[PDB]
Curated annotation (Swiss-Prot), chain B:
The chain holds residues 828 to 875 of 3159 of the full protein. Residues 1-44 form the HSA domain. It comes from Homo sapiens. The lineage of its organism: Eukaryota, Metazoa, Chordata, Craniata, Vertebrata. It is found in: Nucleus. Component of the NuA4 histone acetyltransferase complex which is involved in transcriptional activation of select genes principally by acetylation of nucleosomal histones H4 and H2A. This modification may both alter nucleosome - DNA interactions and promote interaction of the modified histones with other proteins which positively regulate transcription. May be required for transcriptional activation of E2F1 and MYC target genes during cellular proliferation. Component of the NuA4 histone acetyltransferase complex which contains the catalytic subunit KAT5/TIP60 and the subunits EP400, TRRAP/PAF400, BRD8/SMAP, EPC1, DMAP1/DNMAP1, RUVBL1/TIP49, RUVBL2, ING3, actin, ACTL6A/BAF53A, MORF4L1/MRG15, MORF4L2/MRGX, MRGBP, YEATS4/GAS41, VPS72/YL1 and MEAF6. May also participate in the formation of NuA4 related complexes which lack the KAT5/TIP60 catalytic subunit, but which include the SWI/SNF related protein SRCAP. The NuA4 complex interacts with MYC and the adenovirus E1A protein. EP400 interacts with TRRAP, RUVBL1 and RUVBL2. This is E1A-binding protein p400.
Swiss-Prot record, chain C:
Residues 1-39 bind DNA. The chain holds residues 168 to 273 of 364 of the full protein. This is Vacuolar protein sorting-associated protein 72 homolog. It is found in: Nucleus. Component of the NuA4 histone acetyltransferase complex which contains the catalytic subunit KAT5/TIP60 and the subunits EP400, TRRAP/PAF400, BRD8/SMAP, EPC1, DMAP1/DNMAP1, RUVBL1/TIP49, RUVBL2, ING3, actin, ACTL6A/BAF53A, MORF4L1/MRG15, MORF4L2/MRGX, MRGBP, YEATS4/GAS41 and VPS72/YL1. Component of a NuA4-related complex which contains EP400, TRRAP/PAF400, SRCAP, BRD8/SMAP, EPC1, DMAP1/DNMAP1, RUVBL1/TIP49, RUVBL2, actin, ACTL6A/BAF53A, VPS72 and YEATS4/GAS41. Also part of a multiprotein complex which contains SRCAP and which binds to H2AZ1/H2AZ. The gene is VPS72. Phosphorylation is enhanced by ZNHIT1 and promotes the interaction of VPS72 with histone H2AZ1. The lineage of its organism: Eukaryota, Metazoa, Chordata, Craniata, Vertebrata. It comes from Homo sapiens.
Curated annotation (Swiss-Prot), chain D:
The gene is ACTL6A. It is linked to ACTL6A mutations have been found in patients with intellectual disability of variable severity, developmental delay, dysmorphic features and digit abnormalities. Additional features may include genitourinary and cardiac defects. The disease phenotype resembles Coffin-Siris syndrome and brachymorphism-onychodysplasia-dysphalangism syndrome. The lineage of its organism: Eukaryota, Metazoa, Chordata, Craniata, Vertebrata. It comes from the Eukaryota. Coiled coil: none annotated. This is Actin-like protein 6A. SUPFAM superfamilies: Actin-like ATPase domain. Component of numerous complexes with chromatin remodeling and histone acetyltransferase activity. Component of the NuA4 histone acetyltransferase complex which contains the catalytic subunit KAT5/TIP60 and the subunits EP400, TRRAP/PAF400, BRD8/SMAP, EPC1, DMAP1/DNMAP1, RUVBL1/TIP49, RUVBL2, ING3, actin, ACTL6A/BAF53A, MORF4L1/MRG15, MORF4L2/MRGX, MRGBP, YEATS4/GAS41, VPS72/YL1 and MEAF6. The NuA4 complex interacts with MYC and the adenovirus E1A protein. It is found in: Nucleus. GO terms for biological process: blastocyst formation; chromatin remodeling; DNA recombination; DNA repair; negative regulation of cell differentiation; nervous system development; neural retina development; positive regulation of cell differentiation. Belongs to the actin family.
Length: 39, 48, 66, 324
């Protein structure tokens, strides 16, 4: 827990923003049709 | 024999000149395509 | 309120399922296996041999410098 | 020596440091009527105002990044590098498309970007960070058109809606948009008051005004649907699953919701269409500058920029060669 904290500090501004954005909006690489890449 | 040599030499020379022109045009087309692909790869490297 | 219900229920779906860990979920989706993220090795030279009945090799250079 | 990131957008200029989250200065932009530099003297003057007044630093020390419109012409970029390097003597330079910066800000390299500014609203598909020039769709139904619907309706109301007065007029029609406009059919409405206290019951107008960008010319939904039609055949599913919006002019209530409905009913139902909801005013206004900031921060930007050495060695040609 402490390691994440002191690592979360020194997180320059852009990355704090990115933390908030990726927290709320997330992503998903897989779309269930990656098999089409094989074919 | 001189007429034969001259006809064959004119043929070879004009066809080498035509080759020069075709290779030149293909080289310019390839250069444009390569520049396009190089810019695309720079864009890919930055996005990546 | 069924339309409003559909709305915030799908939002709730996203929120709750994002809490689970790719397991614990009854609809155990298939083949996640989270592959490697590669993550840099700078400029690279790729050697790729593939079956095409026949075998072919493709050598990829990352940038024009190399 | 923290890298500086500027957006020279058409309607408001956003500037800041690469490592800082927000553009520390955001002021109204003009020399960018059609989308690129119309007046080099005025553009140079506003840039000088930027470095000196806005950020209180010389351009000779920090590395500099600028962003240009997707459809801008090449001569604009060449002259931009010439002017910047000759006059301000920066150490290193770069140029990037605003749509690409929007897609980077969202952490989604493959995307479709909807954005609008002074006189223009555009749809751009970006695949792996490359803007498909042939796929861009540009429409005149920009925020200016809607704000002029607002202004005409206000003049019909007969309210009293030198240059500073006109700036105030434009701002109020913009300020009214954020609070009132939503995309008898609207039921009772807001009492939005002017600084002097004037107001009215802003009724159905709040519904009919935003309707222009869909139905006054190609509306936004048509703009995007044809944009992807002109792009590659098989990358199209990727764009729909990656549609993004940016720009303060896009800040209307339920605007993104109406876009999602329009695209869902226009796209084949089977498709994975989705809109990334960076709907907050802060998000949309910072999106492009955010992408520029991230681009500048990384440890590879030290190799991507156009160092002053490069421009000393070669002239304007470097912009086409170093900037996608």
């Amino acid at each position: 827990l402490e390691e994440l904290a002191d690592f979360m500090e020194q997180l320059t501004p852009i990355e704090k923003y990115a933390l908030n954005y990726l927290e709320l909006f997330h992503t998903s690489i897989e779309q269930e049709k990656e098999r089409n890449s094989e074919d | 024999q001189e007429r034969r040599w001259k006809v064959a030499a004119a043929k070879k020379l004009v066809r080498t000149v035509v080759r020069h022109h075709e290779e030149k045009q293909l080289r310019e087309e390839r250069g444009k395509k390569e520049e396009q692909s190089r810019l695309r790869r720079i864009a890919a490297s930055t996005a990546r | 309120t069924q339309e409003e219900l559909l709305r915030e229920a799908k939002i709730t779906e996203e929120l709750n399922l994002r809490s689970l860990e790719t397991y614990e979920r009854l609809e155990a989706d298939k083949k996640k296996q989270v592959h490697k993220k590669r993550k840099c090795p700078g400029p690279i030279i790729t050697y790729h041999s593939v079956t095409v009945r026949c075998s072919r090799t493709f050598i990829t250079f990352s940038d024009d410098a190399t | 020596v923290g890298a500086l990131v500027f957006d020279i957008g058409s309607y408001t200029v956003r500037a800041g440091y690469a490592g800082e989250d927000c553009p520390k200065v955001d002021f109204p932009t003009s020399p960018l009527k059609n989308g690129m530099v119309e007046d080099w003297d005025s553009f140079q003057a506003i840039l000088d105002h930027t470095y000196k007044m806005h950020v209180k630093s010389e351009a000779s020390l920090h590395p500099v990044l600028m962003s240009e419109a997707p459809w801008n012409t090449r001569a604009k970029r060449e002259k931009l590098t010439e002017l910047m390097f000759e006059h301000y003597n920066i150490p290193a330079f770069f140029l990037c498309k605003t749509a690409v910066l929007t897609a980077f800000a969202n952490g989604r390299s493959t995307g479709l970007i909807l954005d609008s500014g002074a006189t223009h609203t555009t749809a751009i598909p970006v695949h792996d960070g490359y803007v498909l020039q042939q796929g861009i769709v540009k429409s005149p139904l920009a925020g200016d058109f809607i704000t002029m619907q607002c202004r005409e309706l206000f003049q019909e109301m007969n309210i009293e809606l030198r240059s500073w007065h006109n700036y105030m007029c434009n701002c109020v029609i913009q300020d009214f948009q954020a609070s009132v406009l939503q995309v008898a059919a609207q039921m009772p409405t807001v009492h939005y008051e002017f600084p002097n206290g004037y107001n009215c019951d802003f009724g159905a107008e709040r519904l009919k005004i935003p309707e222009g960008l869909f139905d006054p010319m190609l509306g936004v939904s048509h703009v995007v649907t044809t944009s992807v039609g002109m792009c590659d055949i098989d990358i199209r599913p990727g764009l729909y699953g990656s549609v993004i919006v940016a720009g303060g002019n896009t800040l209307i209530q339920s605007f993104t919701d109406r876009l999602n409905r329009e695209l869902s009913q226009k796209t084949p139902p089977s498709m994975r269409l989705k809109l990334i909801a960076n709907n907050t005013t802060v998000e949309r206004r910072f999106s492009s500058w955010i992408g520029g900031s991230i681009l500048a921060s990384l440890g590879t930007f030290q190799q991507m920029w156009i160092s002053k050495q490069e421009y000393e060695e070669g002239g304007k040609q470097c912009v086409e060669r170093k900037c996608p």
